[PDB]
Design a protein around this ligand. Structure first.
Ligand SMILES: *Cc1c(COP(=O)(O)O)cnc(C)c1O
Lengths: 194, 711, 234
């Protein structure tokens, strides 16, 4: 775990990429009035008005959802709420209560989410305030400048491994897991720049 | 609805003169005026007369004796109480639902009072009626849309033909104008479930204690087939009950599933008990799945509660022990397990929502209620995929339903709501218990034999009599305590002929002769056969039709003790064969049939046949595919050993299936074939009592044949 | 190219053709759609059986006496008088005015009849409708197999602009006309290109004026305007 976590800065770039995503989501929620979040009604006659998320537009399991007016949930501020895809389809089809974490950290706490007449998602708090949720669309200049600095660090760490791997004293079975760990970090940093 | 009551007389003139002035004003708007006597007279004009909507009485005379007894019956009944100067309310009149309309004794203002009574009566009509029925009555008097379906359009096409005018004058103008399709905007559509139809389903499920109830417009037999098309995919396993209906047989022949049949309890008289508690255990469910090839975990269970005779089960133990996420209760005979406190925790709709399970019930509407034919309901209690269950409803229901049946289906749910509707359930129970006590009273005091009611020795209580293990009236060997109940309104008359130990007697009269005797007066027996008689004491049977049944029973003892002739007693049976039934009396026919039952041994060949289960080779769905190609043959009755049948044997008596379509009779199910061969001999000597089996066809020699599959 | 002695005409099925198209299959400058006339007949109680582009249909069975036949002609002559004199919508169609009194305020009967006729020529309705019905979509599996996937819970909905190559689950029944478009179990590929264009054309012509919304049995209406149909999961 140490050789595939902090050796060539595997996890070291993961805790640094979160600061770029946190700064990127701060600028996307400011201009969230351009692209809202329209929920479509799934086919079939049901007792309760069921809802269905976007089809091929979103495929992630732990996707994030932005919001316009921020609220004070659990005695703290929040700028983005992430819901689980395996748990969103169950609540929107069978009812009950939904559980979602705040700011991508902590446990999945319970929220007062309901359905809106304009096909949206209104988040209620302790003061009965409305907040329409939204999703980030498909790159600012400030985020791109900070992202290229972190992406260049991955090429520098990968260049060191592609030069000293000829050590005879190093077993061959260890090289099969180090290369697989470096490609996992590089495949994640190339997703936010899409 | 145009009866106005005027109670008491003050004796003065300034109060009786406005009564006479109002008497001449209410008759101009079609209203019947009645004048009861004392306080007990007005109470008899509400329970016996349901067309009353106006009570006029002095407020300063009976302010507490009338505002309490009337509120216990009809709460929304308007009260035209006339107050005075020194009039006030009472502290004991706050928790009572009433409608008091105050007026004065002003002379000459009787015309304005008549307009207020008509408007108040219209408010009572627009309140007790559901919004679906309200839209149907208003569309006839105002809605006059042209170019619509059907083609008659309120009976217009019938007025152009001489033969058509006879069919239009039979019903009425309002009858033909009420049959409209879904081509109306202010009434919505049934398949769309919007508008008046959306609020109609919420009004039935709320009163009957349910989440959402549908209105099947194709009878109960169709509602049972829709449930099977949900919790039984193409290749699953269901837990259908053995005592199933003819509609449930075709359900197993349309879905490629592997059903598992239970073994309910039974006695010697033919009254089937219920499924034991050991069949609901987890060690019993997985026992029959591993034995039967091609069977997975059961996902659906069909439980007949109650049965055809009326025996409630114990839903408090099934919803906890039986591990089935889709438990079905065939409540096609008890649509009243809610409006009485002696039915709590006895049905699927009593209680709450079971975590991880759902309750499906197909309660019949045109059986023991008040609605047109082809009407049923589907009660859903749970959080399942209702959209999938609704797809099977549109495949059997046409796009243009009949609103005349829908308006009556919801009416049955509105006639029972409130204290005015609850008196019909409790009133039918009181009339049933009273009829049960009249049998035991006319049994000991009589001189000779008399009918007996299948009831415990103690019937003083007013509740469901449980089937304990230390009793001898039920006769069920090894029965579970607090599992089987008794329906008070299902009086089962046990005719003499058998003992209390299960053997036979020497003097007795079968129930088949008594069944045809009641038809001469206009009484149709629901179930008959060995030595039992089933009747239906629902809300349709009032005190007139209930007391007339006892009088016909006393006439049978008189005609049998005096030894009368068949021609001078049963004219319908004499017309079937006047030559054979010439010199025959009522005592000679009753004694000859009783000896045939003991000789052929009916209780032994019936208790052992329906107990064991024949070897099921293939699924019932595979038997229907062979008939579609044309590979169905028939053999003799003594040659069907080892063959796969194609029909469901439903012998009368009793009334339960014997061999399911797709089973084989081998060496294990030997008594099963013996029951069919016994009925072919006992029902051939005397005409009228022929063998009636839904499957055995009559030939020209007497031997019956069944339909099997080609080898 | 129609076969002789094969197609017959029903005398009682009177099909009224409104002026709007030519005899060669093209369009014209002056034209009145049949959807506007259908709303005027409903005011007097006449329910139109079939309506859409420039055609009508009425049922003259044995129950239609001489009163209902003569009353239909009187309502048609009143539409010409109200259109030639250029009247208002509020003083002619009270049911349509109650749907949106703000938009249908200063609008007359001649302004609405000309704005809708220009949308049919611009979006080209007769050409996109004739080519979307001849080319049948590619049927992948049988309609019975498409219902088996819905019982297990493998159904989803995609947008109208993102559905090329997916198997539908419902039956598209657009009004007008009244015939099915895609059967439950077919796939829209490159061969059935005009088939998808017919659905996208009705979403734009039936979204500017209230009362003339797009009616397709299978396309649910949303708040953004883009209709979505139910398909099967991959
Ligand atoms: C009588 C009965 C039926 C048939 O009822 P219909 O509404 O006439 O179809 C179906 N199931 C059971 C259990 C019945 O007793």
């Amino acid at each position: 775990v140490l050789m595939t976590g902090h050796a060539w800065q595997q996890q070291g770039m993961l805790t640094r990429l979160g600061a770029i995503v946190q700064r990127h989501l701060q600028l996307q929620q400011q201009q969230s009035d351009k692209t809202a979040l329209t929920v479509i009604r799934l086919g079939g006659i049901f007792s309760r008005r069921q809802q269905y998320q976007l089809p091929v537009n979103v495929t992630a399991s732990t996707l994030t959802l932005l919001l316009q007016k921020p609220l004070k949930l659990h005695d703290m501020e929040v700028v983005h709420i992430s819901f689980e895809r395996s748990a969103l389809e169950q609540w929107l089809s069978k009812g009950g209560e939904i559980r979602g974490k705040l700011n991508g950290i902590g446990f999945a706490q319970k929220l007062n989410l309901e359905v809106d007449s304009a096909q949206h998602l209104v988040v209620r708090d302790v003061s009965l305030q409305g907040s329409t949720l939204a999703l980030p669309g498909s790159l600012p200049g400030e985020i791109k400048q900070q992202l290229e600095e972190l992406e260049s660090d991955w090429r520098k760490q990968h260049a060191l491994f592609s030069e000293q791997q000829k050590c005879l004293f190093i077993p061959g079975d260890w090289l099969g897991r180090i290369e697989a760990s470096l490609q996992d970090v590089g495949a994640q940093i190339r997703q936010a720049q899409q | 609805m145009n009866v106005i009551a005027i109670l008491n007389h003050m004796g003065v003139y300034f109060k009786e003169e406005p009564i006479r002035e109002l008497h001449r004003a209410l008759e101009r708007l079609n209203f019947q005026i009645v004048y009861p006597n004392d306080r007990d007279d007005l109470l008899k004009l509400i329970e016996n007369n349901a067309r009353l909507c106006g009570v006029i009485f002095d407020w300063d005379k009976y302010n507490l004796e009338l505002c309490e007894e009337i509120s216990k019956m009809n709460e929304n009944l308007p009260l035209y109480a006339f107050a005075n100067t020194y009039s006030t309310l009472d502290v004991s009149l706050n928790d009572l639902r009433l409608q008091i309309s105050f007026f004065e004794y002003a002379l000459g203002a009787a015309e304005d009072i008549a307009n207020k009574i008509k408007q108040t009566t219209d408010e009572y009509i627009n309140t007790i009626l559901p919004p679906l029925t309200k839209a149907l009555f208003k569309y006839v008097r105002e809605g006059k849309y042209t170019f619509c379906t059907p083609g008659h359009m309120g009976g217009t096409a019938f007025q152009k033909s001489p033969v058509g005018s006879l069919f239009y004058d039979f019903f009425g103008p309002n009858t033909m104008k009420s049959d409209i399709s879904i081509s109306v905007s202010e009434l919505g559509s049934l398949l769309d479930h919007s508008g008046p139809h959306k609020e109609a389903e919420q009004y039935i499920a709320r009163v009957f204690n349910a989440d959402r109830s549908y209105m099947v417009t194709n009878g109960t037999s169709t509602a049972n087939k829709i449930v099977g098309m949900y919790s039984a995919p193409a290749g699953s396993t269901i837990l259908i009950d053995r005592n199933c209906h003819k509609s449930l047989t075709h359900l197993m022949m349309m879905s490629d599933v592997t059903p598992i049949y239970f073994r309910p309890t039974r006695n010697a008289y033919g009254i089937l008990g219920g499924i034991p508690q050991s069949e609901f255990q987890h060690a019993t469910i997985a026992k029959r799945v591993k034995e039967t090839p091609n069977a997975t975990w059961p996902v659906h269970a069909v439980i007949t509660n109650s049965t055809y005779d009326g025996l409630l089960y114990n839903t408090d133990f099934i919803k906890k022990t039986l591990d089935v996420k889709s438990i079905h209760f065939d409540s096609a005979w008890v649509p009243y397990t809610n409006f009485s406190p002696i039915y709590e925790g006895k049905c699927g709709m009593s209680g709450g929502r079971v975590e991880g399970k759902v309750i499906y019930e197909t309660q019949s509407t045109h059986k023991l209620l008040a609605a047109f034919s082809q009407a049923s309901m589907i009660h859903v209690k749970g959080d399942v995929n209702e959209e999938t269950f609704n797809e099977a409803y549109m495949m059997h229901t046409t796009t243009s339903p009949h609103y005349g049946i829908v308006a009556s289906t919801e009416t049955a749910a509105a006639m029972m709501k409130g204290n005015a509707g609850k008196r019909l359930i409790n009133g039918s129970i009181e009339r049933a218990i009273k009829f049960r006590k009249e049998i035991k009273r006319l049994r000991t005091e009589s001189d000779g034999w008399f009918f007996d009611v299948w009831q415990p020795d103690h019937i003083d209580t007013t509740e469901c009599w449980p089937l304990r293990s230390d009793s001898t009236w039920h006769g069920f060997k090894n029965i579970d305590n607090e599992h089987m109940y008794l329906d008070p309104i299902k009086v089962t008359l046990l005719t003499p002929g058998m003992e209390k130990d299960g053997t036979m007697s020497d003097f007795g009269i079968p129930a088949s002769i008594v069944a045809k005797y009641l038809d001469e007066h206009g009484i149709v027996v629901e179930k008959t056969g060995p030595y039992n008689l089933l009747f239906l004491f629902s809300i349709g049977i009032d005190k007139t039709k209930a007391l007339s049944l006892l009088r016909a029973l006393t006439d049978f003892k008189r005609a049998f003790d005096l030894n009368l002739r068949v021609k001078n007693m049963l004219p319908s049976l004499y017309r079937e064969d006047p030559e054979f039934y010439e010199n025959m009396r009522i005592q000679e026919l009753a004694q000859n049939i009783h000896k045939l039952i003991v000789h052929h041994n009916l209780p032994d060949l019936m208790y052992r046949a329906f107990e064991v289960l024949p070897t099921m080779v293939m699924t019932p769905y595979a038997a229907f595919q062979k008939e579609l190609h044309g590979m169905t043959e028939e053999v003799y009755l003594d040659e069907m050993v080892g063959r796969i049948n194609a029909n469901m044997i439903l012998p009368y008596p009793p009334g339960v299936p014997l061999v399911m379509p797709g089973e084989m009779i081998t060496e294990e199910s030997r008594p099963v074939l013996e029951f069919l061969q016994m009925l072919c001999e006992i029902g051939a000597h005397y005409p009228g009592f022929e063998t009636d089996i839904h499957g055995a066809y009559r030939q020209a020699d007497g031997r019956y044949t069944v339909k099997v599959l080609k080898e």
